[PDB]
Design a protein around this ligand. Structure first.
Ligand SMILES: Cc1ccc(S(=O)(=O)Nc2cc(Oc3ccccc3)ccc2C(=O)O)cc1
Length: 559
């Protein structure tokens, strides 16, 4: 059926939308071509709607059913707990959209009488009503990019805060444990960026003659069918669940996940949805399962040999045994046809890759540099354009989420993050005197509050001490960065080194943790290096919960 139906009423903004980069003094030292940086607005909502609206086509076969059964089996071992209203409330971010029933985030987190009473009635209701389509709000997402040689805004659909908390109660544990129990080493969110690289590299080497590819499904969420969503629930239903939760899952499936009415910021009727909503708890888990499910079966239909999957929401990368160039290309083409029948048509057609570094999955790619010792070391990098366009924007305006702090944690090893992000942001903090101030940032969707002064410990635990000494990056990685800095108008190496060296001295003089950030973060800047020994604090970090599951659009905060 139609992924969407439109009444005519427009997708409205809930306040003035900023589309241009504010000519600012701190933004300019970072990037000069400020006219190349823009933020999507509801003004392009009509373009997106036209792209994500279509009639889906789905034909299921034996391979599909076979993989589903296999998945159902591993799911069968799972035992979901069910969170109490309190637990689910602690998971609610402080900046989470308030409810239309008289309360907001704060209240929820504070367990106020009015917050809990309503949330309880919404749950009681989920247990009693198994049919009434739950109302959702559709808004145009505001994201930052760099004009290309512009993207329409993304459309987000989320339910009320009351409903969001009940989802946590009945499905948090499910979406946190089932993917791994079901997909194994294929579930990409269980890995830290260093662990993701390792998995890719080890998998690449386990092949006599490796052949890999990334698969980009054209607007994946709209391709998800009502059938896919019930198949997804049937996987959840294999779990040992409390009666209240099993019913809650049954009700949420029919009343929210499979579809529902759409309302704009103005309380107007926008239309209907019959595909995946981006703003619910099961979106990441559901997408990962569905992509994995169809892909695994697509591989068997196409005769691809010994496939290894790595799934992250709707992002997928496969690595298998080559059967030669012709054969690989035909096999790949047969794969896309199987996927197209399973209702997951490609956006960018897929191309076979015989070199690990040229494979972009999760917007990233594996690459290689060298540690002080001269030894090779693989790390995860990515074109810096978007992270840089966003660093500029987050430097000019106050934003709930600091993508830059995220990008620095996830890409600490990369040449661009060490030379640009760390230098630009550490110098700024010093000036405003806020090196202590904790900042929120997201990792695989989950919200986290992080103290800038802890970056060193964080980086060593996640990437190893090498992230402080990598040098001699690849000629491929160097070009990409260079040609990007030119595009955006970012100062050259010399300028950043000079800036870094000053940021460093200023830090070292302060001593304490600041002295530590200086010593390790900017050791690449000075000639007279400093033996970088293991940071004590790092052996006392619990970064476990950081890499367990995906939560994008799931309204998750990890206090
Ligand atoms: C974090 C970082 C680490 C080492 C260095 S370096 O000055 O020791 N060497 C390099 C300096 C570069 O300068 C740039 C050239 C073009 C675009 C951006 C940077 C590029 C690559 C390397 C290297 O080690 O291979 C600079 C920044």
């Amino acid at each position: 059926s139609m992924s969407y139906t439109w009444t005519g009423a427009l997708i409205t903004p809930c306040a003035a939308e900023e589309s241009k980069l504010p000519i600012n003094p701190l933004s300019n030292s970072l990037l000069r071509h400020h006219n190349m940086v823009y933020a999507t607005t509801s003004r392009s909502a009509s373009l997106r709607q036209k792209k994500v609206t279509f009639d889906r086509l789905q034909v299921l076969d034996d391979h599909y059913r076979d993989v589903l059964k296999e998945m159902k089996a591993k799911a069968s071992t799972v035992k979901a707990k069910l969170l109490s209203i309190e637990e689910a409330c602690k998971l609610t971010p402080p900046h989470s959209a308030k409810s239309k029933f008289g309360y907001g985030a704060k209240d929820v987190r504070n367990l106020s009488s009015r917050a809990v009473n309503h949330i309880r009635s919404v749950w009681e209701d989920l247990l009693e009503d198994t049919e009434t389509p739950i109302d959702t709000t559709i808004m145009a997402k505001s994201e930052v990019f760099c004009v290309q040689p512009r993207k329409p805004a993304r459309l987000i659909v989320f339910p009320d805060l009351g409903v969001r908390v009940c989802e946590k109660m009945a499905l948090y544990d499910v979406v946190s444990t089932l993917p791994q129990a079901v997909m194994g080493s294929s579930y990409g969110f269980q890995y830290s960026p260093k662990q993701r690289v390792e998995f890719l590299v080890n998998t690449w080497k386990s092949k006599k003659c490796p052949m890999g590819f990334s698969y980009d499904t054209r607007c994946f969420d709209s391709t998800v069918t009502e059938s896919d969503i019930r198949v997804e629930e049937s996987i959840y239903q294999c779990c040992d669940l409390a009666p209240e939760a099993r019913q809650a899952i049954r009700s949420l499936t029919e009343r929210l996940y499979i579809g529902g009415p759409l309302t704009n910021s103005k309380g107007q009727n926008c239309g209907y949805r019959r595909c995946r909503a981006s703003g619910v708890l099961t979106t990441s888990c559901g997408n990962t399962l569905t992509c994995y499910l169809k892909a695994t079966a697509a591989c068997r239909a196409a005769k691809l040999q010994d496939c290894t999957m790595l799934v992250n929401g709707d992002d997928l990368v496969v690595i298998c045994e080559s059967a030669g160039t012709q054969e690989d290309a035909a096999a790949l083409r047969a794969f896309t046809e199987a996927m197209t029948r399973y209702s997951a048509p490609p956006g960018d057609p897929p191309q076979p890759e015989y070199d690990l570094e040229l494979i972009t999955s999760c917007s990233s790619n594996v690459s290689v540099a060298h540690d002080a010792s001269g030894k090779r070391v693989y790390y995860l990098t990515r074109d810096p354009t978007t992270p840089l366009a966003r660093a500029a924007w987050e430097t000019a305006r106050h934003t709930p989420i600091n993508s830059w702090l995220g990008n620095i944690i996830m890409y600490a090893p990369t040449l661009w993050a060490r030379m640009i992000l760390m230098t630009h942001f550490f110098s700024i903090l010093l000036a405003q005197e806020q090196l202590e101030k904790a900042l929120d940032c997201q990792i695989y969707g989950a919200c986290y509050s992080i103290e800038p002064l802890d970056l060193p410990q964080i980086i060593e635990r996640l990437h190893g001490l090498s992230a402080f000494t990598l040098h001699s990056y690849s000629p491929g990685e160097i070009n990409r960065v260079a040609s990007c800095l030119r595009k955006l108008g970012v100062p050259p190496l010399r300028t950043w080194r000079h800036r870094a060296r000053s940021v460093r001295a200023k830090l070292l003089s302060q001593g304490g943790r600041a002295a530590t950030c200086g010593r390790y973060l900017f050791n690449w800047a000075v000639r007279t290096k400093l033996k970088l020994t293991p940071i004590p604090a790092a052996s006392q970090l619990d970064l476990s919960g950081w890499f367990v599951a995906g939560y994008s659009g799931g309204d998750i905060y990890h206090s």
